[PDB]
Design an enzyme around this catalytic site. Sequence first.
Site, mmCIF file in Angstrom:
data_model
loop_
_atom_site.group_PDB
_atom_site.id
_atom_site.type_symbol
_atom_site.label_atom_id
_atom_site.label_comp_id
_atom_site.label_asym_id
_atom_site.label_seq_id
_atom_site.Cartn_x
_atom_site.Cartn_y
_atom_site.Cartn_z
ATOM 1 N N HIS A 260 0.849 -1.158 0.000
ATOM 2 C CA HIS A 260 0.000 0.000 0.000
ATOM 3 C C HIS A 260 0.898 1.226 0.000
ATOM 4 O O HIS A 260 2.126 1.105 0.073
ATOM 5 C CB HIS A 260 -0.868 0.026 1.248
ATOM 6 C CG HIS A 260 -0.071 0.053 2.518
ATOM 7 N ND1 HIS A 260 0.371 -1.072 3.169
ATOM 8 C CD2 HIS A 260 0.419 1.094 3.213
ATOM 9 C CE1 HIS A 260 1.110 -0.721 4.208
ATOM 10 N NE2 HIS A 260 1.171 0.588 4.242
ATOM 11 N N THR B 273 2.930 1.625 11.282
ATOM 12 C CA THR B 273 2.669 3.071 11.361
ATOM 13 C C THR B 273 1.221 3.426 11.468
ATOM 14 O O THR B 273 0.902 4.616 11.475
ATOM 15 C CB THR B 273 3.242 3.771 10.135
ATOM 16 O OG1 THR B 273 2.545 3.305 8.978
ATOM 17 C CG2 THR B 273 4.767 3.577 10.041
HETATM 18 C C1 LIG Z 1 -1.489 -7.423 6.022
HETATM 19 C C2 LIG Z 1 -1.542 -5.919 6.250
HETATM 20 O O1 LIG Z 1 -0.227 -5.492 6.548
HETATM 21 C C3 LIG Z 1 -0.058 -4.141 7.013
HETATM 22 C C4 LIG Z 1 1.102 -3.831 7.692
HETATM 23 C C5 LIG Z 1 1.329 -2.571 8.178
HETATM 24 C C6 LIG Z 1 0.377 -1.601 8.034
HETATM 25 C C7 LIG Z 1 0.578 -0.177 8.593
HETATM 26 C C8 LIG Z 1 1.028 0.785 7.449
HETATM 27 O O2 LIG Z 1 2.233 0.700 7.097
HETATM 28 O O3 LIG Z 1 0.116 1.574 6.994
HETATM 29 C C9 LIG Z 1 -0.792 -1.904 7.343
HETATM 30 C C10 LIG Z 1 -1.029 -3.194 6.829
HETATM 31 ZN ZN LIG Z 2 2.214 1.759 5.474
#
Ligand SMILES: CCOc1ccc(CC(=O)O)cc1
Ligand SMILES: [Zn+2]
Length: 258
Positions: free
Chosen positions: A92, A196
């Site tokens: 993401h 985060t």
């Molecule tokens: C499987 C989902 O894995 C994730 C891991 C960290 C975050 C926190 C971020 O970096 O926004 C969100 C999702």
């Molecule tokens: Zn992130």
Amino acid sequence: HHWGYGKHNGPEHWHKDFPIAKGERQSPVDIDTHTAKYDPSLKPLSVSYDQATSLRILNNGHAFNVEFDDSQDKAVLKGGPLDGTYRLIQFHFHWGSLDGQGSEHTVDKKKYAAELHLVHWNTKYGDFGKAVQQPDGLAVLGIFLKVGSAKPGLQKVVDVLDSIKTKGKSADFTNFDPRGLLPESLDYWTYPGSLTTPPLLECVTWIVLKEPISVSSEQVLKFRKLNFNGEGEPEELMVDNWRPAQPLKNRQIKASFK
Ligand SMILES: CCOc1ccc(CC(=O)O)cc1
Ligand SMILES: [Zn+2]
Ligand SMILES: CCOc1ccc(CC(=O)O)cc1
Ligand SMILES: [Cl-]
């Protein structure tokens, strides 16, 4: 939990539901390039994404997420500071309302337009949910985005965003090759930190690439047309979904490069 990025539910508030917000290994951090030390002990970084199997793209009301099949070692991160094998589960981004902000990590206090997070879990823990309970459970590969020339390997992402404008919308996103999101160099900084977003768990080995990727203004403009809200709710544009830099405390950031 109704955490978000607004005035009323944003990063300054998170600590009341998630007290680890004020912990000893929170992320992101500012990377001070004149304090980070080259570490000759770091082994070479291995990004093995040849067999990466993307599934779906989802708007979760915080970001858009591309999810991968992580039922086998199809796409893994190894080497660098890591012991063992970390499996890619999803990526993401975090981005800004304008080009001068958006990243979570900063480099000598410089904010980039956006930051890409490729999320991997340590296979010795068997699933993601177990991994986030361990201090070495995740490896997140962080890639800065600056605005310049278009990034061709991002355009398939940009092209589907109109189909997941609001929270809870998803689309098929098979056959996407995340190798197209990497810069040429794998030079990196590494430090121990956290998720985060809530729940802010202190389970991440961060690996932040030094070389940003360039994307076009048109490409990041399209990120900014997403919505935090669900369909039928008042529209809130999905912008400024980044947490600011947190205290480094008793941590050292190591460089893979002189
Ligand atoms: C499987 C989902 O894995 C994730 C891991 C960290 C975050 C926190 C971020 O970096 O926004 C969100 C999702
Ligand atoms: Zn992130
Ligand atoms: C918060 C828990 O989220 C989880 C997400 C995925 C798994 C399974 C996997 O590792 O793909 C287990 C738990
Ligand atoms: Cl690039």
